[model samples]
Target: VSEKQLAEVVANTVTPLMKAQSVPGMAVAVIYQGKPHYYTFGKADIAANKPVTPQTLFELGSISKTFTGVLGGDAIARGEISLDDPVTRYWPQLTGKQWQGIRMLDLATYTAGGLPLQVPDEVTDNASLVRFYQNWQPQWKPGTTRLYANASIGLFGALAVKPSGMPYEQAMTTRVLKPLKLDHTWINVPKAEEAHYAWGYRDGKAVRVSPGMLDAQAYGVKTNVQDMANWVMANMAPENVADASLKQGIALAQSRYWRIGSMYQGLGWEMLNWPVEANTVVEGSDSKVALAPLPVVEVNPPAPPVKASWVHKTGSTGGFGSYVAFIPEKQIGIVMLANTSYPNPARVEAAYHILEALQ
Candidate 1:
């Protein structure tokens, strides 16, 4: 019941932001105590007057990294891989030994210290992706610094495909989505549902439809709010969670195995709440904004201490953005999927306002 109220407020808060940003549509879903309450605001199609429902498919963009993260942890759970194991263990042809010294954790944590974000235009094709890391030596030693690299995670996914003996997309479907009965999540948008796909305002008109390719291994996943609610429910279950494949997988994903400042990044999920922001409110009182001295958040220049210590994973790409996070104190999980280029992390804090209203 409380979630219903908060959901209403979340939807209301999202309206002005979406319009002001010219965001064509937004989907927000909250799962508390393993129950789903979801809402979608605005039109899936502004020109045709198509309504946005909980089932409307939208691109997940970089948010798919969390999905990849879950897969990585699951790989460890099945004894298929080791977290500390080097990336060379799986794809040995990565050429130089410098790439070999970096552990799987480095790749997952975005600290492999490879070439900067955006693989050069010449780096196309699956085989080419393998060489990009091999040809380039680390700009910094493994795990010395923090850099968010989508291509690095993509390599992890692709390598997982070679060893796990499962197609990366099918691994997500068979391991994570299917067991949770998440029929709506897919790397490729099905033909039957093609018409329901949202086309955001592109070039001043409602024309851009999110493509399923490009980010296949690391992003461009499309799932509806209904399906994501199930994903959230799986994340919220604390005990006996291992009985459910999705929850079980999410459990390890949320564990803080790697440290960045106060942020603990597991195979896929990030621990945000464990870190504190000096400016955040003190117990029962007000406080000025401040950064907790954690090198993780400090990785970004002009660093600010994290305001909230919650585990989070945010993803953004060319056409859309997504956020999935769970609050440790509240035992709650929320997902935001939107049809615009806004940063995926943009709406994550919006969850805080709703969380506050629940108080």
Candidate 2:
């Protein structure tokens, strides 16, 4: 698409957010073929009225999990951990009658046999987090169901350290972020860079504070568009990328390792069903169709579901709303970032519109 057309597409998101925040600043970037298409509107610090640019930093929130997931996989590539191993093998303290049945990959998938969605603030430290799980028994059977659980994923980060001798924070920087030359990203958001870190805003008020989710293996990393694009470029060319490390991290992020009832999930990313209003049934070709070539691979559903296929994930935190998705068959991926608490069509919406336009 031409630059003018892209600007019109982005205005759909940019104009509304700018008006609502009264912040007068917005920045966006799109990557295609490992190249960047970026746009800046308003300013980075609306109070001071600084113009937004490619350098503006954004909180990024749950997009941070994508980074942590990479940490797990990068650790694997480094000969550190095994996804199939059980959580009990490392944090024996958390292992008990209920959790003993689940595997480590289960934690990453947020389907650790139905882990609890909320943990009390009393889960103050590593030991406390462990105690809560050991005494805790999930409501659903392990592997029989799936629910999004932050506790399970955070625990995965904790147990993740056993195999990866590298601390989670350093592992992410050295393995993924740094390799891409993204010097502005961080988990700790060091004193020097602290000035550059963006303060989160909600309801037209400030929500910025010291780091709460400091666990780099979880969702603690803070970054801006410049750094995240590096991440995008690395993964965007998954099948074609020459770098072994970037290739390895992307592979793990996209793995659909388990099914959670109607939804399918990957280690870090999610297998989103790209829902369509008007369904089209396409016939199979000569040799065979849909996993028939690999007979060993069983279809998750004997018949296609209400929706044909999906691959996506949604991210939210205090001040960030984000979505990243790509359809391998169509070679299309759309990414969006918002600075406010709301203003999203949901991540699934990005895919819906993109697919619709494709048709």
Candidate 3:
């Protein structure tokens, strides 16, 4: 596609959506025909008069779970942990009837049987968080149905550390980010680069990702379009990763380990057949069941994984919003980052349309 045509399509597709939502700033990128296309809008900071750029940082919210999943997979590959192992093996303080039945696999799949959407504010410290788990009761049977929960995967950061023998933040940097060369991505943003951190907003007030007790394990990743492109491509093309451990980890993370309705799920990504209708897929059983507890019908996969697939994930926090999707067979992907909190079917709509247009 010509430069002018790409700009026109992006303007027609993205500009109105940003305006419609009253978003203050955003950055968008699409990987088409193995090349990167980028566009930015509004301001990273209204008062500072900064523009959102390819290098501007934005919080990734729950999408950080994908990185956690990959790191856990790496730990598993290294024989540090097993999916069948009870989570109590690491957090023995969780010993008891309810905790014994819960396994690493359950936690990774969001089927550990139930966790709230967020950890309570009262869980302000590690001891308090551990106590919260100790006092908790399962909402459903330990290995049944999916219930989306941050506290579920957030524990993986700690659980993974036992086997990997590294701090969660350092593990992510060494195991995943360094190999992928995502230099700008951070679980904790450095002081020197503070200027590039986008001023995410909600109701016109600037907000940032709070450092909760499980921040590194949950919604604490900060990165930019350049790093996002690397992440998207890494998901689509694991073979491009040179480090053997990282390659194994990425492959295991993307492999569909469980099923919900017609949709198959990898560690942190959801998979569907191509030529997908975003509206229908998002509204379908797979997405719905993932958000709440419900009986699931699981499907076993063939020896090698499905190649022609559309993999996607969505993310949001009080102050930031993000969406990422890619098609490996077609070699296409898109990342949308905005400094506004809103439910965005429009993100999917825009990405699907652009993928078709570029094709």
Candidate 4:
């Protein structure tokens, strides 16, 4: 399709949604036939009247989980860790029996016996963090129930990079972001890039994510749409990745590990059968799924990566919203990033509309 045609399609789909949600600004990247198309709308800062640009940085929120997921995969590929290894293996201080049955894979898959969506309010420091894990008890048998939670993947990320003897952010940069050439993406926005960081709006007031325990591991990435599009391409075509270890890591992270109703669980992505309806995508992404425990069936001998599928993830913070979806079979993907925190269903619907038009 011509660039003009693609721009029109994106604008028609995104403008209405932005208006409905009172979004201040948005940046979108669509990949069609293995090529990328960029679009920007409105203001990055409403008061300052800063316009959105392809280089504008928006908070990634939970989409950051995919990076940690891939980093875990890289560690696994390097033989620094094993999914079956017990949590206690990394932090032997968790001598409790609860830690014994919890494996690294269980955490990555969100099957760590119904962990909470975030670290408890009382956990303020390293001492308390360790105590929280030591005292915590599982609500269900490990691997039998999937509860989407940052606490699960956050801890998984912490331990996954432990063998590398580096902080989580540094480990991710060296092992995943740099290798993927995502130079503009960061867990902590450097001082030099402050001008490009968009001011997130909530309730007509400017706001940004407040750092919390494991925030970096959970929902703390900031990046532009172009870099996200590149990451999407890497996942869609892993063989083209120059780093052999990263290629293997991408494969491991994308592999289907379990099934929860219609949604297939990958390391960080949620997978559905391709050519899916928007409602189905919304159903799988609803808040109910993220806040409660749901039974999961293990994909025995885990399913290898396949192209005939739709994979996606949604992210949001106090004042930002983001979503990414791609179909390997069709060689198409979409990235939606906005400065205002809007509804997840709206993001999915907008993306589906644009993707359908492109397809």
Highest lDDT against the true fold, candidate: 4
Model 3 TM-score on a 0 to 1 scale: 0.94
**Which ten-residue region of model 3 has the weakest summed lDDT?**
296-305
Q: TM-score, each model?
A: 0.84, 0.80, 0.94, 0.98
Residue-level lDDT of model 1, residues 53-101, one tens digit each, is 8889877766777778777766666767766777777877876867767
- Steric clash pairs (candidate 3): none
Q: Per-residue lDDT of 1-359 in model 4, one digit per residue for the tens?
A: 66788889888888888888788899999999899888899999878889999899999999999988899998899999998899889989988887778899999988989888889888899999988888888889999998889889999999999999999988999988888899999788889998999888888789998878988889988999899999999999899999888898899998999988877999887788887778888876778655668898888788988788889999999899999999899989999999988878888888888888886
Tens digit of per-residue lDDT, candidate 3, span 114-149: 777788988888789888888888868875678788
Task: Name the top TM-score candidate.
Answer: 4
Candidate structures ordered by TM-score, highest first: 4, 3, 1, 2
- Model 2 C-alpha lDDT per residue in residues 9-52, reported as the tens digit of each score: 66765566557545345555565434566767765565665555
Using lDDT as the yardstick, the better of models 1 and 3 is 3
Ranking by lDDT: 4, 3, 1, 2
Instruction: State candidate 4's TM-score.
Output: 0.98
Q: lDDT value for candidate 1?
A: 0.64
Return the TM-score for candidate 1, rounded to 2 decimals.
0.84
Better TM-score candidate (3, 4) = 4
Candidate 2: clashing pairs of residues = 25-43, 43-50, 113-142, 272-310
Count backbone overlaps in model 2.
Answer: 4
